[PDB]
């Protein structure tokens, strides 16, 4: 019953986060802060895919007859590249001397951003092969972890600066994504409970963070 309970907890946070995010879109922004709204729009698009998966899950769990963990990959293969792009946009926001927008970043860096998303795709493909038992768990863990490390290395060396604001955002995200790999080791129920709660942290906490940064930047404009 704890897969269902953790799914409901995840859905609860998704709904409240979506409401917060929509109000966030309409907060007026100073010039330098425009990219924060570009990030929040993409986080809301991630939420649409996440929500469709979670409604599918709670309906499916009524009559589970097979191990449905692999179905998460149809969400992740869409959401995780968008989340890596929004992370790049947020690092560029933090670290850039004057105003920066996603078009400037995309137009400049599309090849490198492709590399990041291709590394991430290989991580997911290896996970999917392990989840569907087309390769053994040990090969899945080692190959998946290799591409997780490559993704986060490529992100670090291009987009971070050496300060504690950067270390918090980078290492929080790295640890949370690593813990999806940790979950892979566990039996059906425990693994799926872990994913249900991890999604709150990887997706919804990120949205709430961006909302609070917008509110902080814009508070004086609002009042």
Author numbering: 2 to 224
Quote the paper:
Phylogenetic analysis shows that, within the rhodopsin superfamily, viral rhodopsins form a monophyletic family that consists of two distinct groups, VR1 and VR2. Here we present the results of a comprehensive structure-function study of two homologous proteins (61% sequence similarity) from the VR1 group, OLPVR1 (ADX06642.1), and VirChR1 (TARA-146-SRF-0.22-3-C376786_1). In this work, we demonstrate that VR1 rhodopsins are Na+/K+ selective light-gated ion channels that are inhibited by divalent cations. VirChR1s have proteorhodopsin-like architecture with short extracellular loops and share several structural features, such as membrane-associated ICL2 helix and an unconventional TM6-TM7 orientation.
Here, we present a high-resolution structure of another VR1 protein, OLPVR1, at 1.4 Å resolution. Type A rhombic crystals were grown at pH 8.0 using the monopalmitolein (MP) host lipid matrix and have the P21212 space group with one protein molecule in the asymmetric unit. Type A and type B crystals resulted in the obtaining of the OLPVR1 structures at the resolution of 1.4 and 1.6 Å, respectively. OLPVR1 molecules are nearly identical in both structures (root mean square deviation (RMSD) less than 0.2 Å), so hereafter, we refer to the structure from type A crystals as it has the highest resolution. The OLPVR1 protein (residues 2–223), all-trans retinal (ATR) covalently bound to K204 (K257 in CrChR28), 9 lipid molecules, and 107 water molecules are clearly resolved in the electron density maps. 2Fo–Fc electron density maps at 1.4 Å reveal two alternative conformations of the retinal in the region of the β-ionone ring. At the same time, the configuration near the Schiff base in both of them is all-trans 15-anti. Strikingly different from other rhodopsins, the intracellular parts of TM6 and TM7 helices of OLPVR1 are significantly moved apart from each other far enough to form a pore. The pore is located at about 8 Å from the cytoplasmic side of the lipid membrane border and connects the inside of the protein with the groove on its surface, which leads further to the intracellular bulk. Surprisingly, in our structure, the groove and a part of the pore are occupied with a fragment of the lipid molecule, a host lipid of the crystallization matrix (MP and MO in case of 1.4 and 1.6 Å structures, respectively), which is likely to be a crystallization artifact and is discussed in more details in the Supplementary Notes.
